Amino acid sequence: PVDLGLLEEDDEFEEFPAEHVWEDNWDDDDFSNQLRAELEKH
Amino acid sequence: KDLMSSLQSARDLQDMRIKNKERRHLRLQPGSLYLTKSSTLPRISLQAAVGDRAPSACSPKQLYIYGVSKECINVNSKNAEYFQFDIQDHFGKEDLCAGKGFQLADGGWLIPSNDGKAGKEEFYRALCDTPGVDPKLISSIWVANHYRWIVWKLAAMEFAFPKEFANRCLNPERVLLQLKYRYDVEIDNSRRSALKKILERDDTAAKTLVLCISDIVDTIELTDGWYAVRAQLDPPLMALVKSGKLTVGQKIITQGAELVGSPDACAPLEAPDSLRLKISANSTRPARWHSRLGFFRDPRPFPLPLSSLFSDGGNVGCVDIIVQRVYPLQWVEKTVSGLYIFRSEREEEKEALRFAEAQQKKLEALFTKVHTEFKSRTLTRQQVHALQDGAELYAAVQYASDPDHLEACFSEEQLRALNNYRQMLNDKKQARIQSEFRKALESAEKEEGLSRDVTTVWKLRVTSYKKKEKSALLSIWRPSSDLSSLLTEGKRYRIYHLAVSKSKSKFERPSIQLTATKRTQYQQLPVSSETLLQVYQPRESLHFSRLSDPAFQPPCSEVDVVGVVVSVVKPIGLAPLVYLSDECLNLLVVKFGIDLNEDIKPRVLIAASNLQCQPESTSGVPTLFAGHFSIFSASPKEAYFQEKVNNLKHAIENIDTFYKEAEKKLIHVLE
Ligand SMILES: [Hg+2]
Ligand SMILES: [Hg+2]
Ligand SMILES: [Hg+2]
Ligand SMILES: [Hg+2]
Numbered sequence: 244p245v246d247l248g249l250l251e252e253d254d255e256f257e258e259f260p261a262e263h264v265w266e267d268n269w270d271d272d273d274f275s276n277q278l279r280a281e282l283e284k285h
Numbered sequence: 286k287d288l289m290s291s292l293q294s295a296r297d298l299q300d301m302r303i304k305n306k307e308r309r310h311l312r313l314q315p316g317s318l319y320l321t322k323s324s325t326l327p328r329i330s331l332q333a334a335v336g337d338r339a340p341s342a343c344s345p346k347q348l349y350i351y352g353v354s355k356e357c358i359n360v361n362s363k364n365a366e367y368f369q370f371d372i373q374d375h376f377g378k379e380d381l382c383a384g385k386g387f388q389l390a391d392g393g394w395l396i397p398s399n400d401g402k403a404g405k406e407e408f409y410r411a412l413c414d415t416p417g418v419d420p421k422l423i424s425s426i427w428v429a430n431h432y433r434w435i436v437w438k439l440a441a442m443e444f445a446f447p448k449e450f451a452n453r454c455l456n457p458e459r460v461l462l463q464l465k466y467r468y469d470v471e472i473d474n475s476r477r478s479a480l481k482k483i484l485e486r487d488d489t490a491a492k493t494l495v496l497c498i499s500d501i502v503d504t505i506e507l508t509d510g511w512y513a514v515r516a517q518l519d520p521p522l523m524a525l526v527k528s529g530k531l532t533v534g535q536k537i538i539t540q541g542a543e544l545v546g547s548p549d550a551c552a553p554l555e556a557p558d559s560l561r562l563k564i565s566a567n568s569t570r571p572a573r574w575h576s577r578l579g580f581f582r583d584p585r586p587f588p589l590p591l592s593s594l595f596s597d598g599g600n601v602g603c604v605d606i607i608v609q610r611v612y613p614l615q616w617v618e619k620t621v622s623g624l625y626i627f628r629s630e631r632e633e634e635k636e637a638l639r640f641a642e643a644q645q646k647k648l649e650a651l652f653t654k655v656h657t658e659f660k661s662r663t664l665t666r667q668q669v670h671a672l673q674d675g676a677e678l679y680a681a682v683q684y685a686s687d688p689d690h691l692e693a694c695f696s697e698e699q700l701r702a703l704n705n706y707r708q709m710l711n712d713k714k715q716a717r718i719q720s721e722f723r724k725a726l727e728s729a730e731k732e733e734g735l736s737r738d739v740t741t742v743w744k745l746r747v748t749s750y751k752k753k754e755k756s757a758l759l760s761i762w763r764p765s766s767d768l769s770s771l772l773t774e775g776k777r778y779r780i781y782h783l784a785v786s787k788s789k790s791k792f793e794r795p796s797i798q799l800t801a802t803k804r805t806q807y808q809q810l811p812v813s814s815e816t817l818l819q820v821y822q823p824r825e826s827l828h829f830s831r832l833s834d835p836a837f838q839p840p841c842s843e844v845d846v847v848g849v850v851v852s853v854v855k856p857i858g859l860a861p862l863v864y865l866s867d868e869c870l871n872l873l874v875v876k877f878g879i880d881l882n883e884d885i886k887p888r889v890l891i892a893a894s895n896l897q898c899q900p901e902s903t904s905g906v907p908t909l910f911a912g913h914f915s916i917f918s919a920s921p922k923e924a925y926f927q928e929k930v931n932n933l934k935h936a937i938e939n940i941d942t943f944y945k946e947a948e949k950k951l952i953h954v955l956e
């Protein structure tokens with residue numbers, strides 16, 4: 244069981260920024276399957 | 286359903302608690318998740334919690350074994366602000382024996398609605414009945430917003446990893462569990478989202494963000510997960526949404542974004558339905574399924590390839606390049622009409638004298654020209670007649686054999702006709718003068734005030750450090766003496782904030798153009814000898830042969846060469862030619878688009894940087910071409926040349942005799 248209360252969730256923002264990622268050319272895996280757009284697909 | 290009366294009971298008491306509650310000030314009471322995360326108890330990368338791989342089920346789900354839903358999956362990031370929990374389907378009928386409302390996690394009553402629902406207000410109600418919460422600091426529009434995103438997130442966490450997120454996600458107890466969470470993150474430890482900062486005017490700098498697309502079709506709306514604003518895509522984005530790349534519900538990463546219609550502060554909730562943000566294609570590149578809506582760690586802008594830049598919008602925030610080539614300064618001129626003109630130094634100093642000379646003659650010619658405008662039957666029946674009209678009376682005194690001795694022969698009314706045609710002549714002269722001045726003086730002040738519009742430019746041929754390349758051009762206007770000596774060929778820099786990648790010109794559309802604006806900064810980074818040679822091909826002074834073999838495009842066509850001039854030729858009708866011959870008695874010709882640099886007299890050691898190939902090679906009569914960026918010289922000190930010249934300086938300091946003459950014979954015959 245994954246204790247949600249422990250999950251480093253999506254929208255847990257970092258206010259103080261000053262405490263791979265982006266892909267070069269716009270259209271060429273990870274930038275395909277968005278944990279949020281699918282509920283839009285169906 | 287209930288006899289529908291035990292609900293207001295539960296409601297008036299609910300309403301009273303809040304009533305008293307807000308009637309005060311009390312001690313905080315972080316919620317469930319806030320006090321959890323708030324500690325040590327090891328967290329769990331939203332990634333790790335899924336072996337790493339985005340979705341794991343498609344179609345009608347591998348099946349709804351674990352747990353899916355209806356009227357939940359058939360939902361969107363634009364309607365979750367409404368969901369409505371059928372109070373009946375989540376507690377069953379075992380907890381429904383309770384008509385005093387369902388008590389919930391964290392403390393705080395969520396009372397179903399008469400209608401059998403559990404929507405926004407219900408939660409707003411509860412979240413106020415919730416201990417450690419002050420209902421003065423929250424409000425219906427506040428919960429609304431959050432009830433939206435705190436849903437879509439959960440929902441989405443459904444049709445995605447069914448195997449690790451059952452429905453243990455969308456229960457009304459993680460909603461009121463989070464809404465409390467947010468009230469802790471934002472109203473208690475008063476920590477502000479990324480867009481709430483920005484909007485409230487407390488970080489504005491639209492520096493590296495991770496946002497998410499929501500509503501879309503003139504403009505779209507992005508979110509940091511907490512609040513959302515309506516962006517403003519540039520043409521190239523306008524296309525990537527109309528084509529379907531920016532799929533509402535995806536994460537991107539802009540850079541120098543910015544605001545329009547943004548006076549000051551305001552709470553993202555009272556967001557002016559005008560204000561908008563401005564994403565810019567070249568400074569935006571999709572971000573992984575997971576990430577982190579909000580500001581991003583590395584505050585330093587991210588680079589990327591020219592190869593990927595577009596042109597209908599955006600400046601690049603950063604580009605990691607290598608100074609392939611470097612050309613000499615150009616003294617551009619904006620013609621009074623349109624069109625711009627390019628001139629070397631020699632030319633914009635020739636033209637600078639040829640003008641300020643000419644148009645300094647005009648300034649005097651206006652006055653030289655206004656300076657050159659200063660210095661029968663008895664005479665008795667006649668004197669009586671040539672007395673009536675004053676016009677002929679004057680005449681009769683000027684073309685007069687005898688002066689004031691005649692006008693003394695008439696002392697009447699007709700002596701007041703001449704003295705009246707006399708003073709009208711003065712106020713005719715005095716008119717021209719006065720006017721003739723002004724007229725001029727005023728046309729010179731309209732002369733002396735006009736000037737040539739001249740500024741200067743520096744072109745650099747740079748290429749992305751990351752293999753291959755698309756060597757585009759960097760133009761730097763009025764280059765500070767510094768900049769000029771910092772950039773050198775074959776080096777690495779990370780130029781940040783470069784002009785709206787304006788499209789190139791001349792024939793087709795490949796590659797692109799870079800211009801640096803007043804907010805560009807050049808950071809020089811190092812390079813390993815060992816890994817330079819891939820992209821960076823130094824300047825090379827051809828051995829003349831190359832121009833022969835159909836395999837040596839030789840860097841964008843530019844070549845630099847050495848040689849001796851056999852003979853100049855200035856073909857009647859403009860377009861000089863310069864015949865050069867190297868050491869292997871090979872010949873080529875340089876077509877001149879500019880003006881011969883003096884020294885190019887027949888038979889002299891001549892070096893030359895920046896020459897362009899012309900069609901139809903392979904014919905003993907090659908054809909280079911000297912343009913604006915061409916340099917020439919009788920004594921080049923440059924490296925790459927040093928050899929190839931000592932080489933050609935050989936057969937000149939060797940035979941020296943039957944040489945030049947034979948070349949002449951070589952070239953003389955080819956004609
Ligand atoms: Hg969940
Ligand atoms: Hg604002
Ligand atoms: Hg080149
Ligand atoms: Hg030779």
Ligand SMILES: [Hg+2]
Nearest residue numbers: 838839842898
């Ligand atoms: Hg060539």
